[PDB]
Paper text:
In previous work, we have investigated the binding preferences of a PDZ domain that is known to interact with the C-terminus of the cystic fibrosis transmembrane conductance regulator (CFTR). The CFTR-associated ligand (CAL) controls the apical membrane half-life of CFTR and is a validated therapeutic target for the disease cystic fibrosis. The result was iCAL36, a decameric peptide with sequence ANSRWPTSII.
For proof-of-principle studies, we chose to further diversify the position with the highest baseline affinity, i.e., P−1 in , by introducing three halogenated substituents. At the P−1 position, we coupled trifluoroacetic acid, 4-fluorobenzoic acid, or 4-bromobenzoic acid to the side-chain terminal amino group, as illustrated in Figure 5A. All three peptides reveal modestly enhanced binding affinity. To explore the stereochemistry of these interactions, we also solved the complex structures of CALP bound to each of these three peptides. Furthermore, the distal functional groups overlap with the surface on CALP contacted by the acetyl group of the P−3 lysine in. Thus, S−1 and S−3 can intersect and could potentially be bridged using a cyclic peptide, a strategy previously employed in targeting PSD-95. The P−1-substituted peptides are the four highest-affinity ligands, and rank-order switches are found largely within experimental uncertainties. A limited set of four organic acid modifications of the iCAL36 P−1 side chain revealed modest enhancements of affinity.
Author numbering:
A (entry chain A): 284 to 370
B (entry chain C): 5 to 10
The structure:
């Protein structure tokens, strides 16, 4: 599908509300495997199971290992821009 | 593959 830019708003007491799988060491993108109901990704409306996370706040995640992506993603605060694509 | 909740 088309590459999309999606905005997520979260407070500091919350996580993103997504489960991710995949990563470069497995030869696949960082993939959303769950959107947790009522948490920030669900509330933002534009992120879905099966989306590959290509970048967050301008940081490329296309070639990131799983744990690298966890560190980068969990560092982001407040108004967070995602670049995603569903395949 | 591993899965992480974040």
């Amino acid at each position: 599908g088309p590459i999309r830019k999606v905005l997520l708003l979260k407070e500091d007491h919350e996580g993103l509300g997504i489960s991710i799988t995949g990563g470069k060491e497995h030869g696949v993108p960082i993939l959303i495997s769950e959107i947790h109901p009522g948490q920030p990704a669900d509330r933002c409306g534009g992120l879905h199971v099966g989306d590959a996370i290509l970048a967050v706040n301008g940081v490329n995640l296309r070639d990131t290992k799983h744990k690298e992506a966890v560190t980068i993603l969990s560092q982001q605060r407040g108004e967070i821009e995602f670049e995603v694509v569903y395949v | 593959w591993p899965t992480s909740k974040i």
